[PDB]
Design a binder for these strands. Structure first.
Ligand SMILES: Cc1cn([C@H]2C[C@H](O)[C@@H](COP(=O)(O)OP(=O)(O)OP(=O)(O)O)O2)c(=O)[nH]c1=O
Ligand SMILES: [Ca+2]
Ligand SMILES: [Ca+2]
Ligand SMILES: [Ca+2]
Length: 341
DNA sequence: CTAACGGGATCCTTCCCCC
DNA sequence: GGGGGAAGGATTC
């Protein structure tokens, strides 16, 4: 297998840069305002000019303005970014029928049937980089290797407008030397669990007893990491089908009053049913983010599709159950639909 | 009515009903 | 012993 992985660079900020090129060279920060107060919210992404000084995704807006008070702070316009993303994905489909769209800005291409070695796969990587910046003037990063995981690691390394190949021989040195926290699927809770077991490299998973590795990170992550360490990972590129659609809004103030929460729950349903855009769900989940950011959720499924009116009636019953069974004030209320037809 | 913070989605684990 | 569905967890974007 030769897998080609395309990852658009600083993508929300770069799209705003494309629609308004005067922004180029300046630090651009794309924020998600929450409306509790002024500048309440977080950073969706920033470009590298803003990232240089520590303004990156996740940190509060007010924190970013303390660091770069004169940066360009734009509100998030995600469906603008989605239509741009949709057009770029359609470009990628010319280079392989086997393609996996992983998120709004990442696609995996199986180029096994289109090139014979890495040298050609590298050249076609440049052909894709040019065509995207040709047709849409967006710089991307190409990562090429033998499986999805190392193709993504390659792109992580060359990330800002790069292209880089991890060959079979670098895969082996990476198995021995790459920090295991830098492996896709290993966040900090799992990474911290691995270090307390002594594992800091992928090869260490072969030396440890499986049951004690399984006992602390789970069966799936264990087989996953062992498979990578044995150089025997090879999940195929598959078309990913969106399995849920939802929306959760922050209330202007915390509450446990059913009548105060109901408008927000209903607006989540309105916006959620719009995003379904045709497509009928048979399962609904009411999702509450509590006082202290803890997410509670009650749902239920039906032998049939759910109309908007049933979504209204049932969300109230499911919301009542959340307050019946939890004592925390709710801070954000939302809804998720799944199990489509 | 301005208060130390978004939002969307996936896969997996755990528990419990059930064959 | 396992298949299945609900709610919680960890991840990533
Ligand atoms: C990391 C991250 C990204 N995003 C959004 C913003 C990005 O435009 C999009 C893809 O994110 P990423 O690909 O993870 O980051 P990026 O594209 O903005 O920067 P990079 O060049 O390093 O890839 O997802 C979030 O909303 N929250 C997050 O925590
Ligand atoms: Ca990415
Ligand atoms: Ca990206
Ligand atoms: Ca990590």
């Amino acid at each position: 297998m030769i897998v080609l992985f395309v990852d658009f660079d600083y993508f929300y900020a770069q799209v705003e840069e494309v629609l308004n090129p005067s922004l180029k060279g300046k630090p651009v920060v794309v924020c998600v305002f929450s409306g509790r107060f002024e500048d309440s919210g977080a950073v969706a992404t920033a470009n590298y000019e803003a990232r240089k000084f520590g303004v990156k995704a996740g940190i509060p807006i007010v924190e970013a303005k303390k660091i770069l008070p004169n940066a360009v702070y734009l509100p998030m316009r995600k469906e603008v970014y989605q239509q741009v993303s949709s057009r770029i994905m359609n470009l990628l489909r010319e280079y392989s029928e086997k393609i996996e769209i992983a998120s709004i800005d990442e696609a995996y291409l199986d180029i096994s049937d289109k090139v014979r070695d890495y040298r050609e796969a590298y050249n076609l990587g440049l052909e894709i980089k040019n065509k995207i910046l040709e047709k849409e003037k967006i710089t991307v990063t190409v990562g090429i290797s033998k499986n999805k995981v190392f193709a993504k690691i390659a792109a992580d390394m060359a990330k800002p407008n790069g292209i880089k190949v991890i060959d079979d021989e670098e895969v082996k040195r990476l198995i021995r030397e790459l920090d295991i926290a830098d492996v896709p699927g290993i966040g900090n809770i799992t990474a911290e669990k691995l270090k307390k077991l002594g594992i800091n490299k992928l090869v260490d998973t072969l030396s440890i007893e499986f049951d004690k590795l399984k006992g602390m990170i789970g069966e799936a992550k264990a087989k996953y990491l062992i498979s990578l360490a044995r150089d025997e990972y090879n999940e195929p590129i598959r078309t990913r089908v969106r399995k849920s659609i939802g929306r959760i809004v922050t209330m202007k103030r915390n509450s446990r009053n059913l009548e105060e929460i109901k408008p927000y729950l209903f607006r989540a349903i309105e916006e959620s049913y719009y995003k379904l855009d045709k497509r009928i769900p048979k399962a609904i989940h009411v999702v509450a983010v509590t006082e202290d950011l803890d997410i509670v959720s009650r749902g239920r499924t039906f032998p049939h599709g759910i109309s908007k009116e049933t979504a209204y009636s049932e969300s109230v019953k499911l919301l009542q159950k959340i307050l019946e069974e939890d004592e925390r004030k709710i801070r954000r209320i939302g809804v998720r639909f799944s199990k489509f037809i």
